[PDB]
Design a protein around this ligand. Structure first.
Ligand code: ET9
Ligand code: MG
Lengths: 406, 553
DNA sequence: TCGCCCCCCTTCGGTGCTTTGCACCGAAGGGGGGC
């Protein structure tokens, strides 16, 4: 095999990200996994003269009770050259979101058969920590295409297509889209017979070397307005402040009629009858909120951004956009774990679900704006992560001025 | 000896050359200290003489070692270090005695001349050029280069640690039931073998180290308790910190208080209830390390309380992996928290404190959550798992908090423990307007160019007010407008503002603040009975907000 | 007149917001401790 020469972007150096503390069982899993990978030559032990590092941890899915090593190559990926400039990128198929069942398969092991450019391997270094710092950290670097590095699907592109071609040929109405280490496989087949074809694809790939999503069932949840028999001064201030905000998104939204219903300095609990004009103005605005917004189109050259608001009782609203107030999608995520009492677990799972929808729909994950303290998130989020990819995120503290999305 | 281990290749940063810094004068006692070390170092091959073809140099000096008679040779490689490549440091943290399990037999060993036993990359040695001054005027000094790791070079610690790890790796794999804590060249070796079998394995380990050029002198070979290790004393059933001597001063400087606070933080790992808020306050606004700072009355009280704690003997115990980890937190006031980690009651593994002020406005529930997160992180480091928490907060208080607060938040498995003062929410805002309560439409504005502003209100019952403000901001005037509504209203009040900013602070239910004005608002909110606070967009001319916007102009 | 590591407390300065100050956060100053 001959390696593909890979570079970082001009004027950029490799990642230098610290390893964070790991539990005893995550450390032991990584030691077992890395020891086996080292014997098989997929990784090599290195010293400290390699100045780069990338954090490593481990996840375990509930329906696959074996640990899965997870290297957080997000920084290395941002610094790696683009392969759309070196002509090795993947096209997203428009038909995947049209399927009634989408199964996620982890095909990361296929990368371990292709060696990595000798000059690039130093950028893939990671460090396994030690309980109570009994020893210094143990460092490895990759000799093959690493799981989680964006260069691996690009370099392995020709190989994976030759592997899938017979299956895609035999099942022309099944759509398979590769995103990093995952295959997203959708069909309109009956659910028990969808899983049968997933097993056939599983077996066909082993000839070389998840749970069902339903985009059919993802719905948009728009801006709704309350409906009552009687309305207070406070209700109309809450109503007008909401529509005023929504006039940044929708076209021709009016608050003069309702606004005046509030003239003078009135008590908040005073009941004000709706004038017929205002009532017309209301039902007018309710209709614009009902059917979607004109003139909003996906731009593949721009990043996706996702905002999330905690609404309470396991409910989480979210919006996906590229330019402010031009939401490509608004939705609501609902918890169902059974206990009802962990915000961080619910937000982490909400992040995975929203990012999963972005992969199915657009082919990439959005940069998240998380409504959580950075230190609260970083204390717990790895305990609930189940994806082989990790999206970009940042941390925001935005009080709800209006209960907009609920 | 010099380890026959392979050298680690190192480079200078791209485009950079080597250091060229002259040697400073030194005393004759240090010159003969260095000449004795260097003459013996050259005999053992640690250094080699060089000539004028090598254009580099770097200054050298010497301090004394804790072993009182020995000197330690050091080289001021600050110039070379800046031009040396970066390294990824493999020392990720400091081992703690609370993370040790009880062991039948224990040994502590230290490697002699550790760094000098590891060879340096051959192509790199020319950059370590130095000189011994020898009574500076009499003659030009003799020049050498290092053949081994120098003390003072940026790469020496990591290259040594990496070499020590390789040397120990065969012995570790052959004896998984022998715990070897490896910190630099200090080796803690514990086992559950009988003392004769244990001493056999130590001989084997020491002989393995010697074949790779690492001696273990008898002087630093500890065989019987108490073992001196990482600043602690290891007894069979317990461990203590080595004695902590607090500074004692008639007149305190800034630097004295800095030393004192550092001592107390070190002590807080096993001495419960240490506080440093009032002593650290004395450091604020100071301008020089030698500035005399008079202790406040509160700082004297805090220091006296810490001294009483420090005169009582304490000890930690060792980790039993078959039992639960339990972390208990107590509130101490003014954003200070102390905690104990134990498994059996009244036998602490370690203690600690949390007292950081994060953000301008916060409350006790947030800070308790931060203390929980610090303890969780510390417990993962030391024991590889999260403890069960005992917290002075009612389950109702917490449940109230994480359903009203708009950010995701959580605490792991925890049990209420009634140790006053309890953590509580000091007020809550009604989710609905309050029947029969006055309705205040507040607003404030400031002219950015000038320093002036106004804050005022109008009410449903006909009350109106305006207060001129000087040296203010736009955000301060809005807090002032809320400040006045609370001042002039009864125990129940409805307030409507157009400041998303002010709404954001108050809605988070802060109970403390770096801001004097926000503190006053907090004090007023605590006195109130019911408070509903609402927001409307500005300049859209809505009801009462338009008239209060009218008024402040 | 040095090096590398962890910790806390204070100070400073860069970032981005439908801002004009403000809150957030990483880095660096001081201190403790280890070898
Ligand atoms: C951890 C270290 C090794 C083992 O630390 P050590 O105290 O056991 O010393 P060493 O084995 O050399 O002599 P020994 O034979 O008496 O045991 C020493 O090589 C070097 C290093 N270290 C220690 N303190 C200092 C210091 O202040 N400044 C510097 N640059 N480096 C230092
Ligand atoms: Mg030594």
């Amino acid at each position: 095999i001959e390696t593909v020469p890979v570079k970082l972007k001009p004027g950029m150096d490799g990642p230098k990200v610290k390893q964070w503390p790991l539990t005893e069982e995550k450390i032991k899993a990584l030691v077992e996994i890395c020891t086996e990978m080292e014997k098989e030559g997929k990784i090599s032990k290195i010293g400290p003269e390699n100045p780069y590092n990338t954090p490593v941890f481990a996840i375990k899915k509930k329906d696959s009770t074996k640990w899965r090593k997870l290297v957080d190559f997000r920084e290395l990926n941002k610094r790696t050259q683009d392969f759309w400039e070196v002509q090795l990128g993947i096209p997203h198929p428009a038909g995947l979101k049209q399927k009634k069942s989408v199964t996620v398969l982890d095909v990361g092991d296929a990368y371990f058969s292709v060696p990595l450019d000798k000059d690039f391997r130093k950028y893939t270094a990671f460090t396994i920590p030690s309980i109570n710092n009994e020893t210094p950290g143990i460092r490895y670097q990759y000799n093959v295409l690493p799981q989680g590095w964006k260069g691996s699907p690009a370099i392995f592109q020709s190989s994976m297509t030759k592997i899938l071609e017979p299956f895609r040929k035999q099942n022309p109405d099944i759509v398979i889209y590769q995103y990093m280490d995952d295959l997203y496989v959708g069909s309109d087949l009956e659910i028990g017979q969808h899983r049968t074809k997933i097993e056939e694809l599983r077996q066909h790939l082993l000839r070389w070397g998840g749970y069902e999503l339903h985009p059919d069932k993802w719905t948009v949840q728009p801006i709704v307005l309350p409906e009552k028999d009687s309305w207070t001064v406070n209700d109309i201030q809450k109503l007008v402040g909401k529509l005023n905000w929504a006039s940044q998104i929708y076209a021709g939204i009016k608050v003069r009629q309702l606004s005046k219903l509030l003239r003078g300095t009135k008590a908040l609990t005073e009941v004000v009858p709706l004038t017929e004009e205002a009532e017309l103005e209301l039902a007018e605005n309710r209709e614009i909120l009902k059917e979607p917004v004109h003139g909003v189109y996906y731009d593949p050259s721009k990043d996706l951004i996702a905002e999330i608001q905690k609404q309470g009782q396991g409910q989480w609203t979210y919006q996906i956009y590229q330019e402010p107030f031009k939401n490509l999608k608004t939705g609501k995520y609902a918890r169902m774990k059974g206990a009802h009492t962990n915000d961080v677990k619910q937000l982490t799972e909400a992040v995975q679900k929203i990012a999963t929808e972005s992969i199915v729909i657009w082919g990439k994950t959005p940069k998240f704006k998380l409504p959580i303290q950075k230190e609260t998130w970083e204390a717990w989020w790895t305990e609930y992560w189940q994806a082989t990819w990790i999206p970009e995120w940042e941390f925001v503290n935005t009080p709800p001025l209006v209960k907009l999305w609920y | 000896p010099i380890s026959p281990i392979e050298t680690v290749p190192v480079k200078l940063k791209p485009g950079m050359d080597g250091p060229k810094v002259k040697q400073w004068p030194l005393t004759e006692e240090k010159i003969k200290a260095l000449v004795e070390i260097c003459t013996e170092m050259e005999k053992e091959g640690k250094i080699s003489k060089i000539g004028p073809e090598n254009p580099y140099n770097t200054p050298v000096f010497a301090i004394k070692k804790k072993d009182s008679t020995k000197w330690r040779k050091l080289v001021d490689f600050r110039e070379l270090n800046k031009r040396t490549q970066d390294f990824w440091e493999v020392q990720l943290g400091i081992p703690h005695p609370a993370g040790l399990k009880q062991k039948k037999s224990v040994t502590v060993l230290d490697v002699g001349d550790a760094f000098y036993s590891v060879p340096l990359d051959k192509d790199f040695r020319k950059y370590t050029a130095f000189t011994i001054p020898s009574i500076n005027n009499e003659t030009p000094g003799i020049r050498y280069q290092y053949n081994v790791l120098p003390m003072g070079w940026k790469g020496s610690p990591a290259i040594f640690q990496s070499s020590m790890t390789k040397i120990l790796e065969p012995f570790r794999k052959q004896n998984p039931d022998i715990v070897i804590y490896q910190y630099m060249d200090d080796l803690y070796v514990g086992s559950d073998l009988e003392i004769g079998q244990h001493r056999t394995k130590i001989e084997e380990l020491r002989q393995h180290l010697l074949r790779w050029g690492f001696t273990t002198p008898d002087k630093k070979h500890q065989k019987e308790p108490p073992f001196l290790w990482m600043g602690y004393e290891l007894h069979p059933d317990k461990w203590t910190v080595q004695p902590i001597v607090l500074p004692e001063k008639d007149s305190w400087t800034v630097n004295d208080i800095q030393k004192l606070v550092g001592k107390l933080n070190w002590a807080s790992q096993i001495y419960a209830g240490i506080k440093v808020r009032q002593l650290s306050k004395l450091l604020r606004g100071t301008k020089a390390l030698t500035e005399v700072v008079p202790l406040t009355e509160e700082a004297e009280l805090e220091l006296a309380e810490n001294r009483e704690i420090l005169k009582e003997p304490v000890h930690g115990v060792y980790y039993d992996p078959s039992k639960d980890l339990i972390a208990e937190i107590q509130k101490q006031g003014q954003g200070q928290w102390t905690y104990q980690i134990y498994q059996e009651p009244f036998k602490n593994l370690k203690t600690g404190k949390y007292a950081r002020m994060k953000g301008a406005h916060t409350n006790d529930v947030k800070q308790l959550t931060e203390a929980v997160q610090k303890i969780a992180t510390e417990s993962i480091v030391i024991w590889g798992k999260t403890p069960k928490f005992k917290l002075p907060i009612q389950k109702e208080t917490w449940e109230a908090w994480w359903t009203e607060y708009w950010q995701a938040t959580w605490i792991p498995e925890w049990e209420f423990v009634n140790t006053p003062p309890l953590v509580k929410l000091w007020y809550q805002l009604e989710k609905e307007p309050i029947i029969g309560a006055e309705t205040f439409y507040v607003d404030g504005a400031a002219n950015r160019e000038t320093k002036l502003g106004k804050a005022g209100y109008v009410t449903d019952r006909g009350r109106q007010k305006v207060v001129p403000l000087t040296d203010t901001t736009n955000q301060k005037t809005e807090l002032q407008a809320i400040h006045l509504a609370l001042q002039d209203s009864g125990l129940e009040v409805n307030i409507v503002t157009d400041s998303q900013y002010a709404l954001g602070i108050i809605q988070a239910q802060p109970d403390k603040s770096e801001s004097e004005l926000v503190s006053q608002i907090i004090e007023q909110l605590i006195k109130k009975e019911k408070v509903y606070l609402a927001w409307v967009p500005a300049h859209k001319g809505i009801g009462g907000n338009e008239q209060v916007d009218k008024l402040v102009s």
